[PDB]
Design a binder for these strands. Sequence first.
DNA 1: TCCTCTTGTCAGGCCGGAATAACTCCCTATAATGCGTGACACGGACTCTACGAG
DNA 2: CTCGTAGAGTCCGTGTCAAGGGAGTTATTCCGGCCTGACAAGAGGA
Lengths: 339, 49, 49, 306
Amino acid sequence: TEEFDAIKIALASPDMIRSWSFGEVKKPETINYRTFKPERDGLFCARIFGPVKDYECLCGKYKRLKHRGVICEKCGVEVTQTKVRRERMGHIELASPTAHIWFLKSLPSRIGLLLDMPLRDIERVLYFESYVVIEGGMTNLERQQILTEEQYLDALEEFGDEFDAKMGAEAIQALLKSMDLEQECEQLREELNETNSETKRKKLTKRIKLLEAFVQSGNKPEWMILTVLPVLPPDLRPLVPLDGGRFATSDLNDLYRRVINRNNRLKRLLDLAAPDIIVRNEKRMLQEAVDALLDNGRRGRAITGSNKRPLKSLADMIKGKQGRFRQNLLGKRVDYSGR
Amino acid sequence: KSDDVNGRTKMYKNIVDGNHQMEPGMPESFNVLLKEIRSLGINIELEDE
Amino acid sequence: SAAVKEFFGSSQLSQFMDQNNPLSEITHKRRISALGPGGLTRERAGFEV
Amino acid sequence: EMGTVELLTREGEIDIAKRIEDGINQVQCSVAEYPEAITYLLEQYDRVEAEEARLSDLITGFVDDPELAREKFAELRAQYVVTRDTIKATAQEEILKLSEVFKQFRLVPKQFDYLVNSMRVMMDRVRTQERLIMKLCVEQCKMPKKNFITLFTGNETSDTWFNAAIAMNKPWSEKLHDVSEEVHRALQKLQQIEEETGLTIEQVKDINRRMSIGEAKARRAKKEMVEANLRLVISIAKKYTNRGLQFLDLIQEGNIGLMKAVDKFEYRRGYKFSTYATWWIRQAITRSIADQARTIRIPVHMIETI
DNA sequence: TCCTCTTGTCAGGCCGGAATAACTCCCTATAATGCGTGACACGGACTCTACGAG
DNA sequence: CTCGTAGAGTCCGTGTCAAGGGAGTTATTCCGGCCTGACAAGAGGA
Ligand SMILES: C[C@H](CCC(=O)NCCC[N+](C)(C)C[C@H](O)CS(=O)(=O)O)[C@H]1CC[C@H]2[C@@H]3[C@H](O)C[C@@H]4C[C@H](O)CC[C@]4(C)[C@H]3C[C@H](O)[C@]12C
Ligand SMILES: [Zn+2]
């Protein structure tokens, strides 16, 4: 056991997300329904997360404790303690960069204020109602100017080249990567030396503080948009067998299933060169799935299968009353107690 | 008493042996918390100095 | 049959008779509840009802 | 989004079907027009005859029995070899006649895809080599881009632009010797690439532009049709909404099925599209509801038995 | 007299064919076309009042 | 000398608490038999 202190929090970079994860979860399958062993490489996977039963591989070639670092050649499961299946994380390759809800919809929209663009505008961008000019060259249009459908059409038709604009969360990420923190910070401090209006000054200070902290911490803005999505270890969203044949699963299994399905379908639709409208719908649905996954409660309320109650997303699982369910009230049942 | 697996088993053995020591470890709920927050795009690591 | 048995079984107003005293039975059968579907909630309630 | 596109009435649908037919036929003729594809045809037909391949791996029905195919491919080999010997005007007319006789054949889609892809990758190699050679030239020799266009364009095979650029005696023209080896070796390599093409170095341009035109035409026609029939897809979707799958997922699977149907639809049979497409849209919707519904996925036959 | 060394024959783990399952390629041809409390505090938008600049 | 803008104020709204038919191919369990270790009883030597 380490002797630690100072717990550090920062945005996870995509290479770190790949770093923690041991394998990619490509197919939504969970278990074989005949023999309830986990399917590879599904949401429950022994070769990725861990061996089901202590010190025994899936296919059953290696069963002795003497084998502990060998990795079964047929089934790519390493022979180790089943408890490891509680900590190993997975990851999913998302085809279309999707926005992180927490950094968008929270009353102060930090993407918005970093981009000094109101929330409604960004909403219009992600849902594919209008484009945004990402470096619109030597033209009569600014760098954060929105163009409507047929304004983008008249511009493209007239301006074929020297004009870079896009739609959706990938557009947002692209334009976000390009912003020069240092120069904009210098501009804002020059405003502070020259600008004298109470509320404008106040807002300016706010923006300045955000930029300063962001550039000091070492977080790069483009990470606010997620490319790789980590998947929680299986044991924390278990699929335990109830007695009598019936099964119980946490909702996260369903949410992950939905995300993987829509991601795979988008992959296929892209490979087929499908019409734009349908790919756009696909990106909308994927955004929806992700937003249910990260923080359920900021949208159209995706109910679960046949249960009427909204399914509980990660954010709900963390925040409770009060907050930490088992760490905070209430409250860690204890042994050696009577009443 | 509740969430530390190794601690609870070691303390069972200690009590049976007639010794009274302790070995707290990390509460399992906190480990779950780390994994659950890490499931988001939030990096939470235990630093060292 | 699904809707009828759902109402009778899995409903707020369909509850286990408390059958330990004749008084308990008779009083439970002659009861008037303001809860349930189409009715007030405890948090909703108010203090004037 | 669906509401914007109005209903592509019947005669419009037959119109776009003719445009699709024209694009597909154009691209099929275009394939016919380079002498390295019949190499692979005859080679795998013999594979089929020597029994190293399959009778269904090469053709999907002729146009105007094993006897007929075997004889037509024997005479195909004969004509091919004789026009290859007689390559040295006459070769262009004989290639046109070989292509016109080969038009008779219809290959099953994967092999036609493979042939269009082999011709695509050879043209890709051509364009990539020319682009890298011109990059090295313009950037290391500071080659003005107007003389680049005029002189370099047209041959891509002869040394006329090479020896004219070095002949202009310009000081960057003298540095041109610094990378003369790379540039002229790439010119020779390209000449060999077209020696394996064999026709020339301009018909590569003609073929890629004609193929792009056909493909774009076909894609646009199918886009129009699909956007017109989105309403049909959503209409059929209403049945399956409450099988634990989401509404929009259903509509998407239906869209994929409708795409397939459009790709396989034949108007010439004379029947209305909607009835025919219904089959594929329902097939896709049913298969997806069966597959993505349950948590512990269950094979489709077992679902049918349930 | 006690402990050690020896002759001899069976059994269990492992692999092969078979037979019931699964997954993709055939799926098709009349027409069907949009349908699913409540108090608090803070922030944003709109209005009013007053000042400075052209 | 006159007009528009800047600043201040108020009201409202939000988050947060209190239709299946099938042909071909491969996987997987299941019974039948081969191939190498291990077990029994006695004998001989210290
Ligand atoms: C969905 C259902 C919820 C029932 C519920 O919530 N009842 C609440 C009943 C409340 N009342 C009526 C008893 C009143 C209150 O308790 C007291 S008061 O009125 O509120 O004061 C769950 C909870 C227990 C689950 C069963 C068990 O696993 C055993 C068995 C396992 C098999 O593999 C599958 C079948 C079985 C029968 C399961 C079925 C089903 O999966 C059950 C009933
Ligand atoms: Zn194994």
